[PDB]
Every structure is written in C-alpha cells, then in structure tokens.
Amino acid sequence: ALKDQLIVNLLKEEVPQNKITVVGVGAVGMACAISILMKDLADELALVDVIEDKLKGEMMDLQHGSLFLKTPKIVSSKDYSVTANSKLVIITAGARQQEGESRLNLVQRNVNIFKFIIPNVVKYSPQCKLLIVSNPVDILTYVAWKISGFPKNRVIGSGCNLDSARFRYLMGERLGVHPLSCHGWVLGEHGDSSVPVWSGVNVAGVSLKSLNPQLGTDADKEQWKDVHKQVVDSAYEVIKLKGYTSWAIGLSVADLAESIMKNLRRVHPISTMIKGLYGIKEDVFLSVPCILGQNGISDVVKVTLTPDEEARLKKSADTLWGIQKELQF
Amino acid sequence: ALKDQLIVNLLKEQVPQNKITVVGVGAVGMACAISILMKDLADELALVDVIEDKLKGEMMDLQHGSLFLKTPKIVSSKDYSVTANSKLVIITAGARQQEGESRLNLVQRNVNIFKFIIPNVVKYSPQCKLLIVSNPVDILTYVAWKISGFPKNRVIGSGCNLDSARFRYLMGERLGVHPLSCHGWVLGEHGDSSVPVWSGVNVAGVSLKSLNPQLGTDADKEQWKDVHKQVVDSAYEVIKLKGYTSWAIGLSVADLAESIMKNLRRVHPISTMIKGLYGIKEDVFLSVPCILGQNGISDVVKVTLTPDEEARLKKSADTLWGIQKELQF
Amino acid sequence: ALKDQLIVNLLKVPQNKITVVGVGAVGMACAISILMKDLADELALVDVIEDKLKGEMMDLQHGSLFLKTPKIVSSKDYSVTANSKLVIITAGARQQEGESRLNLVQRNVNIFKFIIPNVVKYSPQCKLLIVSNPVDILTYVAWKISGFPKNRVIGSGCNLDSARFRYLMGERLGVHPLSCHGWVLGEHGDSSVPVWSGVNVAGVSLKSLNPQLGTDADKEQWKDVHKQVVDSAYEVIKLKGYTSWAIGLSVADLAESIMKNLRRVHPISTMIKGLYGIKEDVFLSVPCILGQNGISDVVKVTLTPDEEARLKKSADTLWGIQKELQF
Amino acid sequence: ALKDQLIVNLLKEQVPQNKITVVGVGAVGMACAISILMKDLADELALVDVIEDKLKGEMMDLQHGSLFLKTPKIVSSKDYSVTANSKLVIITAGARQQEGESRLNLVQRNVNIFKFIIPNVVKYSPQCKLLIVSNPVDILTYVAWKISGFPKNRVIGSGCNLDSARFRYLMGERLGVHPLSCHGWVLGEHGDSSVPVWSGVNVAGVSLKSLNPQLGTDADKEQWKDVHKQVVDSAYEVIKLKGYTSWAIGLSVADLAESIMKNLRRVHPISTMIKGLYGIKEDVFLSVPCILGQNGISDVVKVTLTPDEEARLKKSADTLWGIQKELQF
Numbered sequence A: 001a002l003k004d005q006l007i008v009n010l011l012k013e014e015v016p017q018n019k020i021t022v023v024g025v026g027a028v029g030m031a032c033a034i035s036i037l038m039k040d041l042a043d044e045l046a047l048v049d050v051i052e053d054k055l056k057g058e059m060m061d062l063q064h065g066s067l068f069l070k071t072p073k074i075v076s077s078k079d080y081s082v083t084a085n086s087k088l089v090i091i092t093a094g095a096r097q098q099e100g101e102s103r104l105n106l107v108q109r110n111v112n113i114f115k116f117i118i119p120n121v122v123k124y125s126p127q128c129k130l131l132i133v134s135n136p137v138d139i140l141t142y143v144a145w146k147i148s149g150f151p152k153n154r155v156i157g158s159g160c161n162l163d164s165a166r167f168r169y170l171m172g173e174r175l176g177v178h179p180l181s182c183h184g185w186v187l188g189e190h191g192d193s194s195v196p197v198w199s200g201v202n203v204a205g206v207s208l209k210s211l212n213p214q215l216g217t218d219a220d221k222e223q224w225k226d227v228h229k230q231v232v233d234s235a236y237e238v239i240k241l242k243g244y245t246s247w248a249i250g251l252s253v254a255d256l257a258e259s260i261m262k263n264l265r266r267v268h269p270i271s272t273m274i275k276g277l278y279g280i281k282e283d284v285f286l287s288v289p290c291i292l293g294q295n296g297i298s299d300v301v302k303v304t305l306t307p308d309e310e311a312r313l314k315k316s317a318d319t320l321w322g323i324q325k326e327l328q329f
Numbered sequence B, D: 001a002l003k004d005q006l007i008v009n010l011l012k013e014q015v016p017q018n019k020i021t022v023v024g025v026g027a028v029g030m031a032c033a034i035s036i037l038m039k040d041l042a043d044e045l046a047l048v049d050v051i052e053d054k055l056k057g058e059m060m061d062l063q064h065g066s067l068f069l070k071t072p073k074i075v076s077s078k079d080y081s082v083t084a085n086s087k088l089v090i091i092t093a094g095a096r097q098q099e100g101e102s103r104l105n106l107v108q109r110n111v112n113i114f115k116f117i118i119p120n121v122v123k124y125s126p127q128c129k130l131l132i133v134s135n136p137v138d139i140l141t142y143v144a145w146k147i148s149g150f151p152k153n154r155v156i157g158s159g160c161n162l163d164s165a166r167f168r169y170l171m172g173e174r175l176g177v178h179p180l181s182c183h184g185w186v187l188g189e190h191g192d193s194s195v196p197v198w199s200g201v202n203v204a205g206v207s208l209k210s211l212n213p214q215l216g217t218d219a220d221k222e223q224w225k226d227v228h229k230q231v232v233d234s235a236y237e238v239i240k241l242k243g244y245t246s247w248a249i250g251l252s253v254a255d256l257a258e259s260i261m262k263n264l265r266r267v268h269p270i271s272t273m274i275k276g277l278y279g280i281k282e283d284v285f286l287s288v289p290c291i292l293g294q295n296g297i298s299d300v301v302k303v304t305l306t307p308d309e310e311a312r313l314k315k316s317a318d319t320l321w322g323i324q325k326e327l328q329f
Numbered sequence C: 001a002l003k004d005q006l007i008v009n010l011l012k013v014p015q016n017k018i019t020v021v022g023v024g025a026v027g028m029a030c031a032i033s034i035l036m037k038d039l040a041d042e043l044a045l046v047d048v049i050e051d052k053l054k055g056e057m058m059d060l061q062h063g064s065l066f067l068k069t070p071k072i073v074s075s076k077d078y079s080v081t082a083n084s085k086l087v088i089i090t091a092g093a094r095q096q097e098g099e100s101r102l103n104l105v106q107r108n109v110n111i112f113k114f115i116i117p118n119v120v121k122y123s124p125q126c127k128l129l130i131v132s133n134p135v136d137i138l139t140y141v142a143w144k145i146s147g148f149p150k151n152r153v154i155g156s157g158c159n160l161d162s163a164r165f166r167y168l169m170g171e172r173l174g175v176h177p178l179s180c181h182g183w184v185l186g187e188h189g190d191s192s193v194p195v196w197s198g199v200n201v202a203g204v205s206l207k208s209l210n211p212q213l214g215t216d217a218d219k220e221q222w223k224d225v226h227k228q229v230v231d232s233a234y235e236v237i238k239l240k241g242y243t244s245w246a247i248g249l250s251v252a253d254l255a256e257s258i259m260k261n262l263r264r265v266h267p268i269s270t271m272i273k274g275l276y277g278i279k280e281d282v283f284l285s286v287p288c289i290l291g292q293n294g295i296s297d298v299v300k301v302t303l304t305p306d307e308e309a310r311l312k313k314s315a316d317t318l319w320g321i322q323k324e325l326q327f
C-alpha cells in the first residue's frame, strides 16, 4: 500500500477534544456551521439531518474547503452515533418562520420534532451543552431542558444575542460608531415581546438617556423607539426580501459557541430559566444577561429595570408562559 | 441632536482603503461574501445584483452580523456607483450549470451579461483587480480581460484553485494527513478536461509516483485516478445532492482574495493567458500555477509536465479554444 | 538563472505599511503583536543601535513562514519608512524602577526633535501613534514638531490603563474583561482618573448598586483597583525590569482600529482644550473615535463633580510640566 | 457585597480543557507564550521558573493584556502544581549557547536541569505532550523521553521546524515567492550537522534539482549550499547582533503547538526516535518529517534521500548518538 510505503505508523489512536455537532442543515444550520468553521472553534464538526441527500451534499461542500480551514474532521449522518462525544450540540432543525409568521406559530410542530432529536443527542453526548436555535427559541430551550434531563446550566437558547447585535448595529449606524463601542441590551422573548433596556444604552459609559431623558418614549424627538421596532421587525423584513435569515444568526450562534468552547465567561442575553427574578415564580425561559462558559450558564446578571421596563419583561414572560405551560409533551 | 450631545465632531467626514465588491448575490456570491468578511480582508464590502429584494435582504442579513465582524461598512445597490473605489471586484453573477450540464454550456448567457457587468465595474474601480468566478471561468477570464482593457495580470480566474483543494482533501483522507501537508496540482480547465499533475504529487517532498510509478494510471492497484475523477465530478455530485455548490468555492475565492489583498505572492492554480507555454499559440486562458499578489498575477511557474500530462494540458487548451474562438463580443 | 528556468516574469509600493521607531522591549512587543494580528503588508523598524536593529529584523524575518506580512525591513535611515500609513514611536528613555514617567520628559522631547521631522519627511500623510513616555506630553510635542493636524497625532494614552482596570474588575467579578466596562481617563500615569460613574456590566451601573463606589466612603474600597492600575507599571518594572507585553497588545489594538477604519472608541491622548474650561493645549486621554484618519470625534463624557475635579487636576499636573519645556 | 448585588450565582469549577504550560520565562519561553496567546490555542496558560520576581512580573504583564486576548486564565508559580491538567508542556529552560559554542556543549548543564524539571512537569498532567525547545534539542528530547518514561509519540523536540522555516524564507527571498509556496526540508540535528534535502526542494511540485542537477553542490553556479550555511549560522548571527534569539523560535513552537492542540496532522520536521530508518540501529533522536496531532507524533514520513543525503543524515545521527553515549542518568 502506498500509504505504508510513505508513512510508518507509530500507534492506533483513540476521541475528539473540542467536537461540535449541528443538528439541521437548513439555512440557519449551515450558516452556524460555516461560521464555526471560520472561527476555528472545533477539532471535529458533525452534521445531522433526516434529509439524506441534502445532508451529504452540504457535508461534501464543507469538506472540499478543508485546505482553507483548521477543522480536520467534518462528518455527517442521519444516525446520531456520528455525534458522539460532542462538547456542544447546536439544534437548528424544525419548521422555520414563513413571511409574516410569528416564531410562536412554530411551537407544537417543533416540540414534536424535539421529541425525536433531544433523546438521540443525549444518548451519544450525555455531558454536552445544548444550544437551542430553532424557534420559538425560548420555549424550545425549556422543552430541550425537560426532555434532556440536563441541569439547566447545560441547556442554552441563542435567545436575544442576535436582537442585541441588531440593536447595536442600528445604534452604531445612527451615531457613526462601530457596534463594538455601542452598548445596549434587548431582553425577554426572542420575538415580538422583546424589551429594550433604555436605561443601560451607552457609548463609553455615557447613558444616552442621561442626555435625552425621553429616550425610547413617544416623546422622543428622534424616535429611538423605532430602533427597537426595527429590531423586532428585522427577521420579518429579511424573510420577505430573501426568504429566510441566515448570516446574522450564524454569527450570533458562533459567538455563543466561542464563549462556551473557550470558557470565556462573557455576558450574553440568552435563553435561561428566570424563576426567582422580577417576582417570576414559574419555569419561564427567556433572555437575561448570562455569564457563559465551559459549563454553560453559571451565573445571571441582575439588570436594574425601570418600572416600565420591568412591566414589559413580565409581559414577555406572561406571553411565553401561556404557551409553554400547556405544551403537549 | 442626541448624536451631537454625545459626540463632538472634530474632523469633516471618507474613502475606503481595502474595499471588496462581490457582483452576484446567489449562493456562490454570498459564500464568497461571508468567507471574505470572516477573514477580515476588507474595510468595506459592496454587493451588486439585479434582483433588488434578494440584494437588499442579503445586505441586511450581513449588516445585522456587524457586531461579530471587523468590516465597518456593508452596502449594496443595482447601481454600480456603490462599488466605487474597490481594490478587488469578484464576479460571480450569471447562469449556473444544472445537473447534466457542462459549465461550457453557460458561455453565451454569461458572455452576454459580462458585456454589461465588466464595463460598469471598471468605470468606478480603476485600481481594482478582477477576480472571475462565473463559469466557464477560464473563457470568462479571457472575456473579462478583452472587455475591461485591463492588463492580463489584473484579470484573474478562480480556475483550479478549488479543483486542487479538492484533490488535496481527497489525497489527505487517503493518507491520514492534513490537506496542508498533501501537495498536488490540478491544472487546465476548471471543468471536465482538468489535468492531475501526478508527477508533482508529494508529501514532505516525497513523490508518490516514485513510490508507485503506476500512480494515476488504470493499472494502479489503488486506483488513484478515481481521486481525479472525483475532483472532476465533485461539482456535479454536490449539485445532484444539495442543488448547487457554495461553501468550497466561497473558501477558494476567499483564499485568492487573501493573497491579493495581503500581497502574499503565494502560488495558486488560477486562470491566466498561457500563450507561449507548452507550444500554445492562441490567447487561451486556463489554470497554471501563478504567483498572486497586490498587482494580481505577476509571474507564472513553468511546471515540468510528463509527456502524457503535457498532452492532456494541450487537449484542455484545444477544448477551450474551440469555444473561445467562436465568441462574438 | 534557476529562478528564470522555474518562473516566467510578467511584471517588473506597499498599501498597508506600518513603521515602528524603537526596537526596545516596548517597540518589539508592538512589532510582534502587529505581525500576529495581520494588520500590515510591510513592517519597517527604525533605531540608532544598528546591530540590535538588524538582529531583531532578522529574528522576525525568520518567522515569515508563520506570518502573513510579506515584507519586514529595517534601517537607521528613515527612507526605509516611506509610504507608512501608521508610524508608531516607542523610542527614548524608558520608565525606571521607582520613578514617574514624567522623569523622562526632557530627554524624550530632545530625541523627538530628531525623530519626528525624519518621520514626517518620508510619510507626510501618516498617522503618528506616540507610545514613548510621558505619552500625553510627547503627543503634544509630536503634534507641534510635525505640523500635522491634530487628528493624525495620537497618544496610546490610557488604552492600557483601561485594559488593566477592566482585567482587575473582571477578576473581582468572575467575568471576562470584555464584559466589564469602565474607563480610566487623563494622564497615562499617577493622576489618571477612574470614571466610576460609567463602570458597568450588562449596562448595569456598579455605582447604582454602591453609590460610594471608588471613594474613601466605599465600604469595599474599590479605589484599591484604581491604585493597582496606577501602580501596575511600577510593580512590573520592579519584578521583570520593564513592561512590554500589555503595552504591545494595547498598541496593536489601536493600530487595528486605525488600519481597519473601525471607529471604535478608545481612551487615548488628544487635545482637550475647551473641555471643563481648560484653556491651554493640554493633551490627555478622553474617549475618542479612532479610524483611518486618526481621531475624528471625541465622546463628551459626563463626569461627576468628583471625577471632573480629578480630571482637571490631571490636566493641571501635565500642563505644569509641559509649560516649562522648550523646543 | 457588590458582586452579589450584581450577579446571582447558579452553579458551583471543571478542569481546563486546553491548558498549556511553558517552563522557563527567558526570551524563548516568553516568545512562545505571547505567540500561543495570540493564536488562541489555550484556555489556560501556566508559567514555571525558579526566578520568582521575573516569573511574577512576566505573568502580570501578560495578564494586563487579557482584554485583547481569548485566554481567560494566566497563572504562574515556582510550584509545579500550577501546571496541573496541561495538554501540552513546553520546556524552554536551560543554558543557552554563546558565540562560538556548540549547542552540544550545553548538554551536561541542561541534563542536570531536566533531571529536576521532567519528573515535576509530568507529575500533574496525565494527558500532556512534552515539547522540548531547550538545546541541544534532539539530545534533550531523548533525555526527556528517558526521564519521563513517556511513550515516544508524546515526547517531541522543536527540532528543525525552525531550520526548515528559515530555509524556506531564504528560498522565498531568492525566488520572489512567499515561503508558504517554497518547499524544502532541513533534517537531522538542529545544529551544525543538519541536512538540506535538495531532492525534495520544489515550487508547485517542480524539483529545483531537476532544473539544476548541480543544486546545493560546490559546482552550483548560484551557490545554493550557502542557503543551508545561512540556516546553520542563523542562530549565531542573530545572537551576535541582538544577544539572543526569540521571535522565530517562539513562532516555530506556536506552529507545533497549533498542530498538537488542534489535532491537525500536519507534517513537521521535529525531533523523534529514528531507530529502524536509514540503517540506524540505536535510539537516536533527530528531525524527520512527522505527522503531528492531539497524541503527539502518531506517524513518521519515510523520506526518500539520495545516497549523499542519506550519508549526511547518518553522519548527523552518528554525531548525536556519540553525545547520547555521554549521558549520565
């Protein structure tokens, strides 16, 4: 054999150390995959879906770029054995928003799919962190948690990481400052009931509300509330124009993957249990600022909300809980 | 204005210094775009296409990921004024091959679009290099060169950079070595007449043909010719499975963009004029190994091919010339 | 030639060139950090110690396989620096054990009378990034000698002090420094001003949770964190003889914003004449928007009366030194 | 407490997953440290040395740059418990060669130091690879191997990775090509008896010796043998000029660290046992091309040498073996 003429093998080796699995090879799944590949986060990437031709085609297309990457093993299968020993399993599969459709409209359809997916993930990577991206992401993080049996620190929703990224982009465009230097937090549901925390919006520690006490109100002369409205509408607008969203959510998820895989303990607004916060007493999942690392969510930042901000957050909690509390599973 | 309360302007405001344009926001174009964005190659990215909604949607989706990137301005329009001052313009627009269709079948459709695209690009980006990705890439590089009035060094076809990356991936899989340490060139047409240069295939400077002189012939017991066959068929197989190719070509183009933008003077197998080499007398464009930097292709490596390999390269040239000489534009 | 047998030539200025002046520990740390961040297509080194300069260039050159900066050059002759987009000045007397950076000022003003006109001659449109100490005064000096408009004369300032502050805060809170926000302004030195009023995590003001934060009345004495920021260079100099790595990374951070036109906000040395009544040409750190044209805009911070008083005192200290210089 | 007002803890600490230790905080050790930090290879970096002030000062200086890095824990101690759970331990401590002094002259000093370092370093890290950088590196890789009792796949010397990087740089300068596209191996001792393998020196798979059969001989009109002489003399030229070498070796070591930490299975010329190749019957360590990944050196490439190249490699082996016979364990 040519291999043996060329190379002397010293030992038969064993398991990857930084393996990531993406479930679902739709547009969101593949954008997560490419972003993760380009950020050199994993030594092995596994893809899983039930559409076998599409799965194999996507795997091959990624594999053919291997020379340009530093992820030496890319694999796929409908069989979850291919996902064994993942540090992080990212769930993106399921029905996706159509034009004008609420993410909440996907709920029972994707719960039903999660009934198959989650036990199969848990079977082969019982120690992984789960990162839920499928919608509605907050409710589906709750579902993944209940079905998996995992402790809550290891079940994370991509949540409002993207909503906040959008907010900071839009704010940066208004101010002529890079989004990295524009700070502001969108919390609650990843969806229509999200909550902009105007009191925390700043550049260089300078509160925009301290310059404009009417920031975010209807009395705001510059209508900054339209920035949050743009955040809310963004996915609908993009779906209308190009049929789906992919690039921004792929980057958002890869950002979360990086914090987890590299144990950074950065703060992200991501989906977790908020029972005990703001007088909430049920197992509601929604985005609050969380310290994210190698053990998932280890700590939550207690954001000081104004009475109105707090009321909006509980309204978001209420909306999610009404659906979550009656799920069939 | 809130902005003026927050910020004192000290300097009247901008011309981009490392601008990249991608023409075409189909799957190849957007794969080039995300790959270029994730490699921090540009300070401005412009997108141009003729489908307005798709174009705006793609632009917006990339923009929403700006927090996670280091490319501070992302713009788009059907108006080529948006592409002004580009250092690199990447042409991906045009018809793409269906299942069972040669890239050579696209030539009439894509020559006719290039008649419009190329003069518009050159109008606003007089310092750019042109990187042709649209197919058939070898003929279209010739066409772009003739239309543009650019010197041949500044008109580059993505060519066999991808075919060679596929070859090296496939070889590495067989050998249990990373593609980076598996060396081998596929030259000629980016298409069915490409040539595997078996004579130069090596690991750590060890020629695989010296270990197995039957390498790449039908008498080869390990059938390494199947590797080149897989390279030839890869686009077709992937199109059969997922409907199109995107990721691998995106990465290949980003690789070439890196060498250009960073003046690396790395060697790539890319489309350039080969008149004067291997007895070729006409203005044939095809892939040979070229030194690639800030002024495009500055130098061509004269590969020492075996008689069969050279015969195969001349046949590739003959095939392209048959089509090329019949073009009217 | 073998080259001509192998290669057919078809074509007989760098676009993203950076020069570092001074190949001391600070300069070389800036050099290696810029190389590993892929900011430049050419790196030029300049110093007056010729063997040291050549050796550092060669040592860097030998790692070229592992870098993406295809030309690394050096000379005592400033012609090597032509066409620089960014020129980083790190040369001069460096801070000594148990001594203020202000103790270096006259010697470094004198060297800047030689360096700056040489830089300006070969790259009249570069941005100047001053790192040599005392950086706030030397930024003013570079500005006066160069004749450049103030946007193109930048001092590394408190970018490092703020990084140190955010590291220490992060260590106290169990959070990455990226998620611990807070600004140190004024002098890059003993009179720096921690802006406790702006310190936050996830937009939550720490001062809102501890109104006395950073004052003597602070039961948890977070003032000790700023004292650590002030003392850091002195401690590191005492322990290893100089500082290099942190400042190299801080400088590379600024060079990234400039070279990539990011328009991020950094606390860096610029003219603050006008701010808080200040009537003289004092340079010190305030939050600045930094990009391809240098400092285009300044963020107007809202300091408490305490913080305002401390910043004016920093301005007074620098001016007191600066007024008695001559060049 | 402010921390408890701000943050709600939800979770009690796992082991680091990608920890690297560097032993020795001289110029080589710190160049390794900064290079590794800037390549995002580790989640924890530990430094060990016996000079306590210098050690603490270097640690602090790195720590202060943490905002600009993605390595969330940097630690140091004279006590080796600080190195616990390392995946890679890099040994740079020891005497260094003076002008006119062979690296081989360092052997008794550095063996005596290794008698202390090696048992201490392996004590706390069951999963570590040992990467030896101290000189004479080949001899000291053998020494580390004998003292540690590790399997040979886990004991690696930085070897000729730098010598080959230098060779490729100088070749690139001669040809006007990036060193990435200039291929060629310097093997054997990292020192005076190294072997330039002319037979493998190529660009784009084109053998330079095939264009000039006199390449690297005294009859070479272009005196390519001087390139190899420059490689041999390089450390001494740099020591003569700046007092020591640091940056190049730092980058070389970080390159090896990358292959190991990311399981890349790239080929590098690094110090390993070559008993069984080229008729060598003793436990000699020297540089040959090795496949490097998460378990160290899993495979060795059997390079095809000319009779003269083989004779030169055996001479290098004889020289190193002679020094191994001087070792006093």
Ligand SMILES: Clc1ccccc1-c1nnn[nH]1
Pocket (backbone or CB within 6 Å): A023, A024, A048, A049, A050, A093, A094, A113, A116, A117, A120
């Ligand atoms: Cl991947 C997947 C994607 C969509 C629907 C269902 C599944 C599934 N996973 N395990 N069984 N079924």
Ligand SMILES: Clc1ccccc1-c1nnn[nH]1
Pocket (backbone or CB within 6 Å): B023, B024, B048, B049, B050, B093, B094, B113, B116, B117, B120
């Ligand atoms: Cl962008 C473009 C995309 C597809 C077809 C044609 C064009 C075009 N460019 N200039 N005029 N038309």
Ligand SMILES: Clc1ccccc1-c1nnn[nH]1
Pocket (backbone or CB within 6 Å): C021, C022, C046, C047, C048, C091, C092, C111, C114, C115, C118
């Ligand atoms: Cl590089 C330099 C470094 C240190 C001192 C002086 C100089 C200088 N530059 N021009 N003249 N002298």
Ligand SMILES: Clc1ccccc1-c1nnn[nH]1
Pocket (backbone or CB within 6 Å): D023, D024, D048, D049, D050, D093, D094, D113, D116, D117, D120
């Ligand atoms: Cl770190 C070290 C560095 C240099 C010399 C000796 C040592 C040592 N290690 N264990 N005991 N002594």
